[PDB]
Amino acid sequence: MSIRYESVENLLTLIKDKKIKPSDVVKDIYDAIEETDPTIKSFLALDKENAIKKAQELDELQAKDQMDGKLFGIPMGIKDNIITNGLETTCASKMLEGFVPIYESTVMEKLHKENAVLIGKLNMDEFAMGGSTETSYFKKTVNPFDHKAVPGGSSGGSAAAVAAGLVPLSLGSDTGGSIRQPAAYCGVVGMKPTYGRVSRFGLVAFASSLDQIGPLTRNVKDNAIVLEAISGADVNDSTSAPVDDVDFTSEIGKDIKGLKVALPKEYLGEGVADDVKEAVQNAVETLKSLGAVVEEVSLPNTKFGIPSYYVIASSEASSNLSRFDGIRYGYHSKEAHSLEELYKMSRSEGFGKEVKRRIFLGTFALSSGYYDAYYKKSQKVRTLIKNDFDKVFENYDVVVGPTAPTTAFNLGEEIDDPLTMYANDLLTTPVNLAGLPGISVPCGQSNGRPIGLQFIGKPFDEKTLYRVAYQYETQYNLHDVYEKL
Amino acid sequence: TKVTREEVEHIANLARLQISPEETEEMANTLESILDFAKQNDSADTEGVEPTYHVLDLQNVLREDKAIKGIPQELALKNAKETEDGQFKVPTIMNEEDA
Amino acid sequence: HFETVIGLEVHVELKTDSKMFSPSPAHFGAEPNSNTNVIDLAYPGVLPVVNKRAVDWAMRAAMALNMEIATESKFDRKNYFYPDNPKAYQISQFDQPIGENGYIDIEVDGETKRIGITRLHMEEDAGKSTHKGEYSLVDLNRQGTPLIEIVSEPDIRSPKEAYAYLEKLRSIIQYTGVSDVKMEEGSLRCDANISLRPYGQEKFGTKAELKNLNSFNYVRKGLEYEEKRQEEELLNGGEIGQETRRFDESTGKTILMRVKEGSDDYRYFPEPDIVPLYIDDAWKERVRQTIPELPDERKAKYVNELGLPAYDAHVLTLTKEMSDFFESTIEHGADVKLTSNWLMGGVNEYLNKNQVELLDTKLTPENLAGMIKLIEDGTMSSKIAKKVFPELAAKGGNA
Ligand SMILES: [Mn+2]
Ligand SMILES: [Mn+2]
């Protein structure tokens, strides 16, 4: 539990300098989990046995002075919607409880190759649908900064585990902000790479056109490092982009004077809280004091983010989840005597209220007579939302504004209010629709609850995001606070 | 507005989701609210705008036609709750009352 | 009174090494669910990867079908729950089918009639669900096998024109070398849509989809039976309705198995997991050239040049091998007519009587060439050819 607060960068060197044995690095982690998660509750399946085994293997490699891997002996947590071979992946749903993947996802493939240590899986909303992880069929994770508050959705477990010092880095999935929002709420660094930057082979789908895996760390630097270890095209993912340059650390540490930063006026709209707004405005000032040039611009179609997002996401969801019938795997209803029942009973009994809501909406949005009026329309709106960015990027390097309209909300506050629960995706959804890369870093606190600052960049321009993200981080961050909780 | 029991049960059927009449009504409203929520897009001028199917501008991603032996039968059935003779066992009585 | 409108929805199994959207081998053994993987099993988190050859072949058969090859073509999802379709959706093509508006000429009791083939897209075959007891056994071995759907413009007008259609189609595809096209093997399946509309008015009577047509000869049986079936209905009284009917091989009658409540909702929408296709000229050429001389122009070449009759030119161009064999043995030294008469019957009748359809691994052009000359002007005549042929065919090469 000692190096439980060290960054991936330092901890990385501590191992290379043989100042610490991999096996103890793990001993610490689990020691941490054992003491903190009972209260946080961010971890699902724990892979301790295997973890210990790998570390034991690493100690040898340490002595033999053969420490290869961008994340050698680095503890890692993985969202339970990302397939891990032999490790129970449930997507935090009854439907997949006990499910043991028979193949390895591409990100885990790469991570293992970099010799990272798999400590466990993180809790999440059921099937990435949700903004507070409260929909989990197993437990409700809590915000390390305020246990009376939520971690965020859907990767709440990933943001909380990192903030709670259970792991140095973790993976999450973003479809509409499921990485950035939980990041903002827990005041940690979250990054949803450009669509196509990180393979999707091995990611239990929610919205094939919006889904994307990303890293969550306690600081901008470590976050870049991890994204280097997972980025890269893959023959198992046809949509994976053929972009070789996967170095994101190069331009970190360089100044941002002259950097053209676009501040969408709609991002400081009416749906934004007062304290959140202030925080980001002082942020804007900070970005100025650093040299960057920030001027207001308009992302008109922003207001249509959430609506179009849901229609699209839900629709696809009404297709990606249809494979869950309890035939080849997953929850198999016992009270079924006919073939129709088996489907209608396994599915209903296995999915939770929210998942079924998306499905109903989606299935409807696609059905005959409504397809054009909802799905097609939403798709056309999506085109608008991207143009907005297209135009803006014609004169600006990056875009800035809050990540979430308000600080983290109370547990059970909006759990029974899906519509307001949705409003929280106001500032995130546009990015997934545009397929651009976004990143959130903490930039304030209101009543102890952290506020998120987001940086929206051009496709495959993550290096620039890290450049401006690191600069700002130097003027503000919560590095010293996680340690105190 | 106007989301009948019928439609609600037609989608459920289209989704293979069992719903009791005591959930139907409830779902009729929820859907309606969500739909009214979805209705917002209509205030966006999309005249002559092409739908966005893919956000990434890739092209022709094909795979060379070269086979790769499949996994063992055991592996393919390892997670199936119901199996018989190396296959997935399932009901099938065709009666317009269960189907 | 009535013109009977009928169309044929035909699927063909492309014989490629691996599957359509999965590296799994397209050919499998006898062990069920042994020729699969996470993709074919629709495990969570799996994605489709398009078979390049499947496309080239798909667009090769589409061209030979006199269709317009799409420049931009993307796949879409056909959503429907069924034990042999694990993803609950079949990756296929809705708009932008790789091939559109084609045709093929056919000869029916009368003269030439050009029937149009509206489209030709690519799909993935489903698994096979065996019905044991009050339960069902599923085998995804076949699941994911590349297919191509060929819908006919509703031009064919009779149970015979249908037959003529399937044969000419089967014939042409066979020449592209993209499928064994055998119905007795499943590498060629056919469904028929039939509806009658009394002359004078535009309204139709009932419309039914015939299922379980498993042989060229069978589609005709059901078709013409159905024709008469709703022929009575239309006259006697008949209650107009959209329906689906199963054809009983034994009795020879079609059985109503369900009445459409409307138009099946498949919620078609563009597969996001597969980036769009952009078939350029260079590409269209590569596959353009890779096409031989199809049956028609191959038959017209048997008309004036090498002035052969009609019945002759039809059965010789029936298959590519047959036709190649004939032309390979023609140059060798066998007199035109000689072989023609020798192939038409004799060899054809030998193949049918011995099921030795593998016209290749048996007697050869080099071998058969001789027997022709031996009779032509060498030894005497015919009758000796009675047995010298079978022996010479099943093995050996000359004597
Ligand atoms: Mn089909
Ligand atoms: Mn059909």
Coordinates of N, CA and C in Angstrom, one line a residue, chain A residues 83 99 102-103 200-204 208 236-239 318-320 322-323 328-329 343 347 363 366-368 371, chain C residues 38 41-49 77 79 81-83 86-89 140 265 267-270 272-273 275:
Chain A
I83 N -13.0 -7.3 -22.8 CA -12.7 -8.7 -22.6 C -11.2 -9.0 -22.2
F99 N -19.6 -15.2 -16.9 CA -19.1 -15.3 -18.2 C -17.6 -15.3 -18.3
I102 N -13.3 -16.6 -23.9 CA -12.4 -17.6 -24.4 C -11.4 -17.1 -25.4
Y103 N -11.3 -15.8 -25.5 CA -10.4 -15.1 -26.4 C -9.9 -13.8 -25.7
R200 N -11.2 -2.1 -31.3 CA -12.4 -2.3 -30.6 C -12.6 -3.8 -30.5
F201 N -11.7 -4.6 -31.1 CA -11.8 -6.1 -31.0 C -11.6 -6.5 -29.6
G202 N -12.7 -6.9 -29.0 CA -12.6 -7.4 -27.6 C -13.4 -6.5 -26.7
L203 N -14.0 -5.5 -27.3 CA -14.8 -4.6 -26.5 C -16.3 -4.9 -26.7
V204 N -17.0 -5.3 -25.6 CA -18.4 -5.7 -25.7 C -19.1 -4.4 -26.2
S208 N -21.3 0.6 -31.7 CA -20.2 0.4 -32.6 C -19.6 1.6 -33.3
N236 N -8.0 -7.2 -36.7 CA -9.2 -7.8 -36.1 C -10.2 -6.7 -35.9
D237 N -9.8 -5.4 -36.2 CA -10.8 -4.3 -36.1 C -10.6 -3.6 -37.5
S238 N -11.6 -3.8 -38.4 CA -11.5 -3.2 -39.7 C -11.6 -1.6 -39.6
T239 N -12.2 -1.1 -38.6 CA -12.3 0.4 -38.5 C -11.0 1.0 -37.9
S318 N -29.7 -1.6 -29.8 CA -30.8 -2.5 -30.1 C -30.4 -3.6 -31.1
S319 N -29.1 -3.5 -31.5 CA -28.6 -4.5 -32.5 C -27.4 -5.2 -31.9
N320 N -26.5 -4.5 -31.2 CA -25.4 -5.2 -30.6 C -25.7 -6.1 -29.4
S322 N -28.6 -7.7 -29.2 CA -29.5 -8.8 -29.6 C -28.8 -10.2 -29.6
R323 N -27.5 -10.2 -29.6 CA -26.8 -11.5 -29.6 C -26.9 -12.2 -28.3
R328 N -25.6 -19.6 -26.5 CA -24.2 -20.0 -26.5 C -23.4 -19.5 -25.3
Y329 N -24.0 -18.6 -24.5 CA -23.3 -18.1 -23.3 C -24.3 -17.1 -22.6
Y343 N -35.9 -16.6 -25.5 CA -35.4 -15.3 -25.9 C -36.0 -14.2 -25.0
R347 N -33.5 -12.6 -22.0 CA -33.3 -11.2 -22.2 C -33.9 -10.3 -21.2
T363 N -34.8 0.0 -30.8 CA -35.6 -0.8 -31.6 C -36.7 0.0 -32.3
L366 N -35.6 2.5 -35.1 CA -35.2 1.8 -36.4 C -36.4 1.2 -37.1
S367 N -37.4 0.7 -36.3 CA -38.6 0.0 -36.8 C -39.2 0.8 -38.0
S368 N -39.9 0.1 -38.8 CA -40.6 0.6 -40.0 C -41.6 1.7 -39.7
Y371 N -38.0 4.8 -38.8 CA -36.6 4.8 -39.1 C -36.1 6.2 -39.6
Chain C
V38 N -14.7 -17.4 -32.0 CA -15.5 -16.4 -31.3 C -16.4 -15.5 -32.2
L41 N -19.4 -17.5 -33.4 CA -20.2 -17.7 -32.3 C -20.8 -16.5 -31.7
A42 N -20.5 -15.4 -32.4 CA -21.1 -14.1 -32.0 C -20.8 -13.7 -30.5
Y43 N -19.6 -14.0 -30.1 CA -19.2 -13.7 -28.7 C -19.1 -12.2 -28.5
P44 N -19.4 -11.7 -27.3 CA -19.4 -10.3 -27.1 C -18.0 -9.7 -27.5
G45 N -18.0 -8.6 -28.1 CA -16.7 -7.9 -28.5 C -16.0 -8.3 -29.8
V46 N -16.7 -9.2 -30.6 CA -16.1 -9.6 -31.8 C -16.5 -8.7 -33.0
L47 N -15.7 -8.6 -34.0 CA -16.0 -7.7 -35.1 C -15.8 -8.4 -36.5
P48 N -16.6 -8.0 -37.5 CA -16.5 -8.6 -38.8 C -15.3 -8.1 -39.7
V49 N -14.7 -9.1 -40.4 CA -13.6 -8.7 -41.3 C -13.9 -9.3 -42.7
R77 N -27.0 -4.3 -41.7 CA -27.4 -5.3 -40.8 C -28.9 -5.7 -41.0
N79 N -31.5 -7.5 -39.0 CA -31.8 -8.0 -37.7 C -33.0 -8.9 -37.6
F81 N -34.0 -12.6 -34.9 CA -33.6 -13.6 -33.9 C -33.9 -15.0 -34.4
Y82 N -32.8 -15.8 -34.4 CA -33.0 -17.2 -34.9 C -31.7 -18.0 -34.5
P83 N -31.9 -19.2 -33.9 CA -30.9 -20.1 -33.4 C -29.6 -20.3 -34.3
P86 N -26.7 -16.4 -34.7 CA -26.2 -15.9 -33.4 C -26.0 -14.5 -33.1
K87 N -25.7 -13.6 -34.1 CA -25.5 -12.2 -33.8 C -26.9 -11.5 -33.8
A88 N -27.9 -12.3 -34.1 CA -29.3 -11.8 -34.1 C -29.5 -10.8 -35.3
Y89 N -28.4 -10.8 -36.1 CA -28.4 -9.9 -37.3 C -27.5 -10.5 -38.4
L140 N -23.4 -24.2 -35.7 CA -22.9 -23.1 -36.4 C -21.7 -23.3 -37.3
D265 N -40.3 -6.6 -40.6 CA -39.4 -5.5 -40.2 C -38.0 -6.0 -39.9
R267 N -35.3 -3.9 -39.7 CA -34.6 -2.8 -39.2 C -33.2 -2.7 -39.9
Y268 N -33.2 -2.6 -41.2 CA -32.0 -2.5 -42.0 C -31.2 -1.2 -41.7
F269 N -29.9 -1.3 -41.5 CA -29.1 -0.1 -41.3 C -27.7 -0.5 -41.5
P270 N -26.9 0.4 -42.1 CA -25.5 0.3 -42.4 C -24.6 -0.2 -41.3
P272 N -21.8 -0.4 -39.1 CA -20.8 0.6 -38.8 C -19.4 -0.1 -38.6
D273 N -19.4 -1.4 -38.2 CA -18.1 -2.1 -38.0 C -17.3 -2.4 -39.3
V275 N -15.9 -0.6 -42.7 CA -15.7 0.6 -43.5 C -16.2 0.4 -44.9

